[PDB]
Write an enzyme that holds these catalytic residues in place. Structure first.
Site, PDB file in Angstrom:
ATOM      1  N   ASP A   1       3.760  -3.946   8.439  1.00 40.51           N
ATOM      2  CA  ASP A   1       2.501  -3.210   8.236  1.00 40.51           C
ATOM      3  C   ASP A   1       1.390  -4.199   8.455  1.00 40.51           C
ATOM      4  OD1 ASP A   1       0.158  -2.111   7.271  1.00 40.51           O
ATOM      5  OD2 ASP A   1       0.939  -1.513   5.255  1.00 40.51           O
TER       6      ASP A   1
ATOM      7  N   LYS B 207      -9.877  -0.339  11.461  1.00 41.22           N
ATOM      8  CA  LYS B 207      -9.981  -1.497  10.589  1.00 41.22           C
ATOM      9  C   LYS B 207     -10.409  -2.749  11.353  1.00 41.22           C
ATOM     10  CE  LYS B 207      -7.155   0.488   6.864  1.00 41.22           C
ATOM     11  NZ  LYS B 207      -6.345  -0.083   5.781  1.00 41.22           N
TER      12      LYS B 207
ATOM     13  N   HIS C 142       0.897  -1.131   0.000  1.00 43.17           N
ATOM     14  CA  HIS C 142       0.000   0.000   0.000  1.00 43.17           C
ATOM     15  C   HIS C 142       0.960   1.210   0.000  1.00 43.17           C
ATOM     16  CE1 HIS C 142      -3.458   2.359   1.865  1.00 43.17           C
ATOM     17  NE2 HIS C 142      -2.432   3.088   2.217  1.00 43.17           N
TER      18      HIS C 142
ATOM     19  N   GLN D 252      -3.929  -4.589   7.734  1.00 44.42           N
ATOM     20  CA  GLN D 252      -5.010  -5.483   7.264  1.00 44.42           C
ATOM     21  C   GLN D 252      -5.090  -6.777   7.960  1.00 44.42           C
ATOM     22  OE1 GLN D 252      -7.678  -4.653   5.873  1.00 44.42           O
ATOM     23  NE2 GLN D 252      -6.751  -2.682   5.084  1.00 44.42           N
TER      24      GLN D 252
ATOM     25  N   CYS E 247      -5.135   2.336  -3.386  1.00 43.78           N
ATOM     26  CA  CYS E 247      -3.862   2.880  -2.883  1.00 43.78           C
ATOM     27  C   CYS E 247      -2.768   1.876  -3.007  1.00 43.78           C
ATOM     28  CB  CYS E 247      -4.070   3.437  -1.424  1.00 43.78           C
ATOM     29  SG  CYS E 247      -5.030   4.960  -1.405  1.00 43.78           S
TER      30      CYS E 247
HETATM   31  C1  LIG Z   1      -5.546   0.688   4.872  1.00 45.22           C
HETATM   32  N1  LIG Z   1      -6.084   0.348   3.484  1.00 45.22           N
HETATM   33  C2  LIG Z   1      -7.518   0.786   3.111  1.00 45.22           C
HETATM   34  C3  LIG Z   1      -7.905   2.234   3.473  1.00 45.22           C
HETATM   35  C4  LIG Z   1      -7.988   0.585   1.651  1.00 45.22           C
HETATM   36  O1  LIG Z   1      -7.338  -0.254   0.983  1.00 45.22           O
HETATM   37  O2  LIG Z   1      -9.035   1.100   1.108  1.00 45.22           O
HETATM   38  C5  LIG Z   1      -4.032   0.244   4.950  1.00 45.22           C
HETATM   39  C6  LIG Z   1      -2.976   1.102   5.353  1.00 45.22           C
HETATM   40  C7  LIG Z   1      -3.318   2.535   5.751  1.00 45.22           C
HETATM   41  O3  LIG Z   1      -4.084   2.510   6.993  1.00 45.22           O
HETATM   42  P1  LIG Z   1      -4.551   3.921   7.430  1.00 45.22           P
HETATM   43  O4  LIG Z   1      -5.355   3.654   8.610  1.00 45.22           O
HETATM   44  O5  LIG Z   1      -3.373   4.753   7.635  1.00 45.22           O
HETATM   45  O6  LIG Z   1      -5.385   4.454   6.263  1.00 45.22           O
HETATM   46  C8  LIG Z   1      -1.662   0.691   5.290  1.00 45.22           C
HETATM   47  N2  LIG Z   1      -1.429  -0.585   4.865  1.00 45.22           N
HETATM   48  C9  LIG Z   1      -2.372  -1.510   4.535  1.00 45.22           C
HETATM   49  C10 LIG Z   1      -1.982  -2.918   4.144  1.00 45.22           C
HETATM   50  C11 LIG Z   1      -3.709  -1.074   4.538  1.00 45.22           C
HETATM   51  O7  LIG Z   1      -4.690  -1.957   4.223  1.00 45.22           O
END
Ligand SMILES: *[C@H](N[C@@H](C)C(=O)O)c1c(COP(=O)(O)O)cnc(C)c1O
Ligand SMILES: *Cc1c(COP(=O)(O)O)cnc(C)c1O
Lengths: 400, 402
Positions: free
Chosen positions: B195, B221, B119, B198, B361
């Site tokens: 990270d 999330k 991401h 997810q 993203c």
């Molecule tokens: C969050 N991904 C989703 C918003 C999407 O895919 O639509 C995500 C982040 C960013 O988290 P934030 O809370 O900062 O927005 C970073 N890495 C991963 C793997 C994901 O899914």
């Protein structure tokens, strides 16, 4: 503005006012029910991420998030795109320093006040250490009144000037418009820490001549925690380097590199505090219903009675004697009691106050004291509360 | 924090009023929030509202106790010590803080390794650092399903200064072999950054098992928390190395006009008033998740993915990510030949089914696969097989209507 009784009609929306006399508003405000209800509505009725997802929940959340940005922009006289959401004032001020770092060269000068809260001091000290800058302090007195003649000498040849609007330790209201005019004449970037003024008195970027301005929603705006604001005047849009980048800040990305999007999204990395932005817009709308003028009037009543009652008990209080330059903050000390003991005694009477250095150690050191007891107000505070406080204070002083 | 007897998904759905109104398949973007999490936060705001940092008064004491409780709950959820947990606004802030706080350790020509499926929040900070300092940024090889070549990983991670990987892909749903990648990085002396945005709340996330040095996740999330709260785990061995990027109130032991001294972790890292309400909400989401159990969550999600993908295969609708469903999280990206993903998503929305469309993203994923974006249905424990059947029925009507 709406028709309502002050402070009674505000108190009715704040159950805690029935339990305590809350005089710790400088640390954080109490939160009215309609602000909690606005956030609850997001969480339970339209919960979704923003960025214009096609689905109806994201459309609704996106509309409410943009609404909230526009509410905040109109509250301070800014344009929609000049408002960036952060977690708090401290984040906002760090981002200013980080984002402008690249523009400085060895020997450049930064000017601030000697009364700054640590969040408006440390970032400049770090930057000055890293790059070999001059960090200078405007002279001032023990009440918090700055020497404006000295300010003109110091701001001349300054690359950046940072000042607090209102002291969290002393309650002094600085002449920010005057200082901002001085900075603009001299060609200095003008950064304002409005954490203690927002929601308590008028804060307007154009009147203050601000290039950057920070505030916290959990204080005077009667918003939730975790939501701060950073105003970035449009002329700095391509100069300010976003310190936090990632999701939501781009236009394109490959393994080899990236291209950032336009403000304000350029500066907001990852999912924003959507609930907090919605709650902060509710608090600004609640403040607007009361009116800033009524808030400032009520707080001046409280300060005047408090400071007259401490004078009668011979309890020293700090900050300006001129009450037109004194915000809703009264720092004081009881001769022969440590400020934590005073605080504890007051807590026994259900009066909440703060004690200690208030994250402004250089103020305490300039005054030659270790800390103070601090009573601070909002529009929901009453003169009856102040009388109850002064009664407890009298008994305390009579006890010795 | 003990599991209880429950009917899944029914006894979760009863606490989320939106499940009565829509079929919410956009959990990767953000989860729906149970009433008890809202209640916990409302309690702070209406009953014990105050700032923390052990102010003398009773409301500050109560707020400070509940804020410390919430940090312990988060620490225990991931197997960390209290002092290793820093609150941030989201995963993106947490990963940027890692790169800003470790930038000083790098020398021109040092190497950073990541995946090609990251991401943007786990890519851009490393790209910026590598461009600024003259570093090598390499990417482990992998296939179009998201399966990494672990032999290539070993080769690339040897000599790396830092390795950053996602636990689960938000676009593809691949579950990477994070434990193995962490073992590699530990054995090669590379700093390991995970990270977990997810993965947290959807499967086990444990810092010891993953061999994590830094780990980031978002409360909004999988943990079923509020917006505006993230977590950064910093293993204690890095307290003397990691430079706090954000400094100010609450971070200090002493200050003068000439300089400052910082306090100890975790307050060293937390500048200004925290998101006290949001940390309390996140601790409530984690307690809610613990009552359900991560095992039950993972099992339910697998059932949903299994039926979804099988049903898409019956419709000849292509889907992405791993075919081995043991390596596929509760995320199904797909496309309908002939139709832009946004138009698919709008048809679904007409039918009160919430999905996301676009690049998610994760542009390098799209560019690797040779597509512009995808339609993405993503799940949580409160999603039902009934819902998947409704979705498959709507997809069938769409496809027959082309
Ligand atoms: C969050 N991904 C989703 C918003 C999407 O895919 O639509 C995500 C982040 C960013 O988290 P934030 O809370 O900062 O927005 C970073 N890495 C991963 C793997 C994901 O899914
Ligand atoms: C409280 C305060 C800050 C910091 O606000 P946070 O919300 O804690 O970051 C900065 N400056 C002043 C003048 C304050 O009163």
């Amino acid at each position: 503005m709406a028709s309502m009784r002050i402070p009674e009609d505000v108190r009715k929306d704040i159950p805690l006012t029935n339990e305590v006399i809350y005089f710790d508003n400088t640390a954080t405000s109490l939160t009215p029910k309609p602000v909690v209800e606005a956030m609850d509505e997001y969480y339970l009725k339209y919960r979704a991420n923003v960025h214009r997802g096609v689905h109806r929940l994201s459309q609704m959340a996106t509309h409410k998030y943009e609404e909230s940005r526009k509410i905040v922009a109109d509250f301070i006289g800014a344009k929609f795109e000049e408002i960036v959401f952060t977690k708090n004032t401290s984040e906002s001020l760090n981002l200013v320093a980080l984002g402008l770092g690249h523009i400085f060269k060895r020997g450049d000068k930064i000017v601030t006040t000697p009364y700054e809260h640590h969040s408006d001091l440390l970032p400049w000290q770090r930057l000055a250490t890293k790059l070999g800058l001059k960090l200078e302090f405007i002279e001032g007195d023990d009440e918090g009144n700055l020497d404006l003649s000295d300010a003109e000498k110091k701001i001349k040849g300054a690359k950046l000037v940072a000042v607090q609007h209102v002291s969290n330790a002393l309650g002094v209201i600085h002449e920010v418009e005057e200082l901002g005019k001085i900075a603009k004449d001299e060609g200095a970037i003008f950064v304002v820490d409005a954490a203690q003024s927002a929601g308590h008195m008028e804060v307007n970027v154009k009147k203050l001549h601000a290039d950057f301005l920070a505030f916290s929603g959990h204080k005077g705006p009667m918003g939730p925690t975790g939501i701060g604001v950073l105003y970035i005047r449009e002329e700095f849009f391509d100069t300010f380097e976003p310190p936090l980048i990632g999701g939501g800040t781009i236009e394109d990305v490959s393994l080899d590199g990236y291209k950032l999007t336009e403000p304000p999204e350029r500066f907001e990395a990852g999912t924003p505090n959507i609930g907090g932005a919605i709650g902060l817009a509710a608090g600004i709308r609640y403040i607007e219903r009361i009116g800033l003028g009524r808030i400032e009037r009520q707080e001046h009543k409280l300060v005047k009675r408090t400071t007259e009652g401490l004078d009668e008990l011979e309890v020293p209080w700090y900050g300006p004697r001129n009450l037109k330059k004194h915000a809703g903050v009264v720092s004081f000390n009881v001769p022969g009691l440590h400020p934590h003991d005073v605080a504890a005694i007051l807590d026994d009477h259900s009066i909440m106050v703060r004690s200690g250095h208030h994250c402004a150690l250089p103020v305490m050191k300039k005054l030659g004291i270790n800390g103070t007891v601090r009573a601070s107000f909002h529009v929901y505070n009453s003169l009856e509360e102040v009388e109850t406080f002064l009664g407890v204070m009298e008994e305390l002083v009579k006890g010795l």
